[PDB]
Design a protein around this ligand. Structure first.
Ligand code: MG
Ligand code: MG
Ligand code: MG
Ligand code: MG
Ligand code: MG
Ligand code: MG
Ligand code: MG
Ligand code: MG
Ligand code: MG
Ligand code: MG
Ligand code: MG
Ligand code: MG
Ligand code: MG
Ligand code: MG
Ligand code: MG
Ligand code: MG
Ligand code: MG
Ligand code: MG
Ligand code: MG
Ligand code: MG
Ligand code: MG
Ligand code: MG
Ligand code: MG
Ligand code: MG
Ligand code: MG
Ligand code: MG
Ligand code: MG
Ligand code: MG
Ligand code: MG
Ligand code: MG
Ligand code: MG
Ligand code: MG
Ligand code: MG
Ligand code: MG
Ligand code: MG
Ligand code: MG
Ligand code: MG
Ligand code: MG
Ligand code: MG
Ligand code: MG
Ligand code: MG
Ligand code: MG
Ligand code: MG
Ligand code: MG
Ligand code: MG
Ligand code: MG
Ligand code: MG
Ligand code: MG
Ligand code: MG
Ligand code: MG
Ligand code: MG
Ligand code: MG
Ligand code: MG
Ligand code: MG
Ligand code: MG
Ligand code: MG
Ligand code: MG
Ligand code: MG
Ligand code: MG
Ligand code: MG
Ligand code: MG
Ligand code: MG
Ligand code: MG
Ligand code: MG
Ligand code: MG
Ligand code: MG
Ligand code: MG
Ligand code: MG
Ligand code: MG
Ligand code: MG
Ligand code: MG
Ligand code: MG
Ligand code: MG
Ligand code: MG
Ligand code: MG
Ligand code: MG
Ligand code: ZN
Lengths: 149, 60, 97, 127, 114, 81
RNA sequence: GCGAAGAACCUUACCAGGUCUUGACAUCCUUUGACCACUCUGGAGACAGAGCUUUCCCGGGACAAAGUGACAGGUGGU
RNA sequence: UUAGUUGGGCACUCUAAAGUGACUGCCGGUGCAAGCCGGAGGAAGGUGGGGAUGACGUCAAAUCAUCAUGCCCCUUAUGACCUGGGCUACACACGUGCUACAAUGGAUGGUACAAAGGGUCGCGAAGCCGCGAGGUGGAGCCAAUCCCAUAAAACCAUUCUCAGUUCGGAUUGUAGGCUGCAACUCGCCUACAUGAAGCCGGAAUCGCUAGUAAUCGUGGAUCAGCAUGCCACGGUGAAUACGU
């Protein structure tokens, strides 16, 4: 079966305001229908809310949250003897950050406030204190891997 | 019924909106382009022969 | 103050005709402004390839018109006579204003 | 006393002109904050003047047409980068280090018959 | 209040929309010729100004008036034996819509799968 | 004519087949003009309208004015599958 | 969302009713050579009935009305 | 000058003919070599992006209805003319699509930025009238000149505040507009009223590897009128590929 080998990787650009690529990846992950400006302004407003409430720069808060919601073990399906079973596996760094951002946005869209800036800010603040929907998502993933070790 | 169809199409209609177009080589009613008065099939074959000036197979 | 528009389906014979007109006007007259290339215009005709079925198999044909514009500023009787007496090739269309 | 550059991006083309002055950016006889009311676009436009340390020594007057606003900004950036390249040869490495001299070659592809887009294909069903 | 009890939390326009026979632009025109602004809530209406609203609404056909009118309109078509009367009786699309498939607002939920 | 060109009635139907039935008007009118508007002066008479096969006789009442002559002669037959 | 890059009439090949038979469309034949167009009457229309009417050119030819075949005419089947 | 308007000039974009330019050509590693991984310069780097281009053969695959044709049938009819109807039927099942189920949103006001195309028995401006679809009017155009032609998403203010609702628009009632001899069966569009299902969809299944998918508008052929279809054009613009 074909695939001819490893492929190149995308090269994102640092954000014009917060000079980091991870902010750009978060903005891309929140994007809908190719509307960069909307998600970009939403992220800027959410970081404004963060800086207003916590009182410190939003970048270290964001990095603490991401470090707090990145996974280590994950469950993958293996087909042996005609049956499929879940098994533990360790993520690479790229997949680590990918899962972190995916869960962050997925469980920030499912909160219960009026706007999206508030939802994103509250999710980030919760993740910075080891609490929230995104935090438990990596807690069970650690649990699910152990129960099938 | 084909020669009667062609003859009726050539005749002046009872009303102006009665009139329609047919390919001038083969009396075909559908798919008639009206810069050439040709249906798609006659158009294609005459274009391959090289007898429609200016038109050539489009690569772009 | 004399305008000439030339239009054809290919640029080789039309290039020859335009250059020849410029040569004759320069010979029998005094002045001429070089041939300005007007934008070519192309039209596309998409046609079903089969006779009965097969919508998804098609064929494009195209038709391009090439244009040039020439001006003579110093008009003299010899220039007008020579320009009107030229025998351009068939397939090249000339319009003099 | 004038350094000229031509930028292009997508279907946008920009005539950028650079004259010694104070830092006044002019776009289509309109102010550069009135023409571009966002901020990241201004950052990407003034990247070429920040890569080298010559941000506030020049005025740029630009003349853009074609494409959309991000295309406007990309064409302006390319034009000012080329104008700075004209100002002094020694700017050539720095502008090359950030990829500000490359004219971006990717342009919108072609609609193909039998498909709904360049690559999008109709929905398939065995039965 | 005005024919019926319109909601009291909302604006006057949106509350007036709750009367049968009044939509959006008719509500705007009512509040325009009634000398009343439209950002004021329904709770904040006075008695004279609401009375002008009542006075204004008496010249428009609303609730049972319109229901009787439309019912008579349908009944005439039914009882003169027209085509639209037949369509009204059988519960099929009245305009020229196609019924080979997909006419469900008139035929109701998909009936017994044969 | 759904415009301000006036209403439409086909001339052979009205001219002297409707305006001519003024004395002893007790007979039917056969017509193929399904497309004619029922004028106010049509009322009282019975017109036989072609439906594709047969001439269905319709007796013009007071409420039929403004409708088309063919609304009262269905073309398709269908009885409960 | 296939022939169909356009089914209200026409398209139209299907059905009902009303009509035609060298014919709606071609070559030759025999007499006449410009026939057609237009007005009114009847009819749903095709079609019939009266008047003004048809101006070939240089024996040739393409057009044109009448009568008759030799023939035409089939989106009929494989 | 209301204005690139007028004068003036090809400087710059642009237009279109002829050339140049990219070849693992140079450097390091690896290999016996082909080649593979990185590096320089360059607008572009590994057949740069995309088209047209479909070998020998397979399926008695599709088409006697685009055309042509052997053989077999009809010939006061299986040929020919006309008006009306039907191809639009409706208990239901399947295929391909469009619109939504709302706050990354709805309504109102302001306000930027395209490309590719069509126009002479044609496109149709300004001004005036109408709530609107439209009417009237006739300018400029056989067009890099004039018209179609308002781009829409995006952005800025005010409001709504999670509600089957200021979501959603089906369905139905009345009054109209155009094209056409004619709009009932059976056209498209508008105004006011009405305000259905629908809270992101089960087992399952489809497309897509980059200016792609996703999303927003624009033009054209057919065409008196009629497209959510087809064919093209640009605006904004991702995620992921460990591996067989
Ligand atoms: Mg990648
Ligand atoms: Mg951007
Ligand atoms: Mg034939
Ligand atoms: Mg037609
Ligand atoms: Mg075609
Ligand atoms: Mg074909
Ligand atoms: Mg196929
Ligand atoms: Mg191909
Ligand atoms: Mg300028
Ligand atoms: Mg400008
Ligand atoms: Mg300026
Ligand atoms: Mg200006
Ligand atoms: Mg451009
Ligand atoms: Mg193609
Ligand atoms: Mg398709
Ligand atoms: Mg399909
Ligand atoms: Mg399936
Ligand atoms: Mg009706
Ligand atoms: Mg109706
Ligand atoms: Mg319909
Ligand atoms: Mg129907
Ligand atoms: Mg339907
Ligand atoms: Mg159907
Ligand atoms: Mg059917
Ligand atoms: Mg269906
Ligand atoms: Mg319905
Ligand atoms: Mg039954
Ligand atoms: Mg398809
Ligand atoms: Mg059909
Ligand atoms: Mg018929
Ligand atoms: Mg035969
Ligand atoms: Mg056989
Ligand atoms: Mg160019
Ligand atoms: Mg390299
Ligand atoms: Mg490209
Ligand atoms: Mg190539
Ligand atoms: Mg077979
Ligand atoms: Mg097969
Ligand atoms: Mg088969
Ligand atoms: Mg078969
Ligand atoms: Mg045959
Ligand atoms: Mg045949
Ligand atoms: Mg067939
Ligand atoms: Mg057949
Ligand atoms: Mg056919
Ligand atoms: Mg029926
Ligand atoms: Mg589609
Ligand atoms: Mg959609
Ligand atoms: Mg709404
Ligand atoms: Mg707006
Ligand atoms: Mg613009
Ligand atoms: Mg243009
Ligand atoms: Mg058009
Ligand atoms: Mg248009
Ligand atoms: Mg436009
Ligand atoms: Mg509800
Ligand atoms: Mg409706
Ligand atoms: Mg209707
Ligand atoms: Mg209709
Ligand atoms: Mg309404
Ligand atoms: Mg109701
Ligand atoms: Mg419900
Ligand atoms: Mg809800
Ligand atoms: Mg798939
Ligand atoms: Mg691929
Ligand atoms: Mg879309
Ligand atoms: Mg939309
Ligand atoms: Mg659109
Ligand atoms: Mg679209
Ligand atoms: Mg459009
Ligand atoms: Mg269109
Ligand atoms: Mg049209
Ligand atoms: Mg469409
Ligand atoms: Mg429509
Ligand atoms: Mg679409
Ligand atoms: Mg792969
Ligand atoms: Zn043909």
């Amino acid at each position: 079966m074909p695939r001819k080998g490893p492929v190149a990787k995308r090269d994102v650009l640092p954000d014009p305001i917060y000079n980091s690529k991870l902010v750009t990846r978060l903005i891309n992950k929140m994007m809908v229908d190719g509307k960069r400006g909307k998600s970009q302004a939403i992220l800027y407003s959410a970081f404004d809310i963060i800086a207003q409430e916590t009182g410190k720069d939003p970048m270290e808060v964001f990095e603490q949250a991401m470090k707090n919601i990145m996974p280590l073990l994950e469950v993958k399906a293996r087909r042996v003897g005609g049956a499929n079973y879940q098994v533990p596996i360790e993520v690479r760094a790229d997949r680590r950050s990918t899962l972190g951002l995916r869960w962050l946005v997925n469980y920030a869209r499912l909160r219960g406030e009026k706007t999206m800036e508030v939802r994103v800010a509250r999710e980030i603040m919760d993740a910075a204190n080891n609490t929230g929907a995104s935090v438990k998502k990596r807690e069970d993933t650690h649990k699910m891997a152990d129960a099938n070790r | 019924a084909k020669k009667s169809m062609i003859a009726k199409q050539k005749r002046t209609p009872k009303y102006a909106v009665q009139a329609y177009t047919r390919c001038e080589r083969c009396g075909r009613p559908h798919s008639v382009i009206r810069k050439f008065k040709l249906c798609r099939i006659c158009f294609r074959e005459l274009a391959y022969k090289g007898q429609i000036p200016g038109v050539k197979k489009a690569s772009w | 103050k004399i305008r000439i528009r030339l239009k054809a389906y290919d640029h080789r014979i039309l290039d020859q005709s335009a250059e020849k007109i410029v040569e004759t006007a320069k010979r029998s007259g005094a002045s001429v402004s070089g041939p300005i290339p007007l934008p070519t215009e192309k039209s596309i005709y998409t046609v079903l390839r089969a006779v009965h079925k097969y919508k998804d198999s098609r064929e494009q044909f195209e038709m391009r018109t090439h244009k040039r514009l020439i001006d003579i500023v110093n008009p003299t009787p010899q220039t007008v006579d020579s320009l009107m007496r030229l025998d351009l090739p068939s397939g090249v269309d000339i319009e003099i204003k | 006393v004038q350094y000229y550059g031509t930028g292009r991006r997508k279907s946008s083309v920009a005539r950028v002109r650079l004259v010694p002055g104070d830092g006044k950016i002019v776009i289509n006889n309109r102010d550069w904050e009135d023409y571009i009311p966002f901020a990241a676009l201004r950052e990407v436009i003034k990247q070429p003047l920040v890569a080298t340390e010559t941000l506030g020594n020049y005025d740029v007057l630009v003349n853009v047409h074609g494409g959309g606003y991000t295309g406007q900004a990309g064409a302006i950036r390319h034009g000012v980068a080329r104008a700075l390249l004209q100002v002094a040869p020694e700017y050539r490495p720095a502008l090359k280090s950030a990829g500000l001299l490359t004219r971006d070659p990717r342009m919108k592809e072609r609609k193909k018959y039998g498909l709904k887009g360049a690559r999008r294909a109709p929905q398939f069903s065995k039965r | 209040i005005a024919g019926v009890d319109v909601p009291r939390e909302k604006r006057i326009v949106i509350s007036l929309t709750y009367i049968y026979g009044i939509g959006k632009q008719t509500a705007k025109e009512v509040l325009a010729e009634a000398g009343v602004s439209e950002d004021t809530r329904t709770r904040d209406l006075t008695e004279e100004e609401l009375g002008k609203i009542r006075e204004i609404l008496d010249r428009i056909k609303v609730e049972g008036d319109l229901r009787r009118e439309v019912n008579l309109n349908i009944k005439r078509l039914i009882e003169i034996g027209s085509y639209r009367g037949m369509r009204h009786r059988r519960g099929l699309p009245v305009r020229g819509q196609n019924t080979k498939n997909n006419a469900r607002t008139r035929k109701g939920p998909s009936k017994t799968v044969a | 004519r759904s415009l301000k060109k006036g209403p439409f009635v086909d001339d052979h139907l009205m001219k002297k087949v409707e305006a001519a039935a003024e004395s002893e008007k007790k007979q039917v009118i056969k017509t193929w003009s399904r497309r004619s508007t029922i004028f106010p002066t049509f009322v009282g008479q019975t017109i036989a309208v072609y439906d594709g096969r047969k001439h269905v006789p319709v007796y013009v009442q007071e409420d039929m004015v403004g409708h088309k002559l063919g609304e009262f002669a269905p073309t398709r037959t269908y009885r409960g599958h």
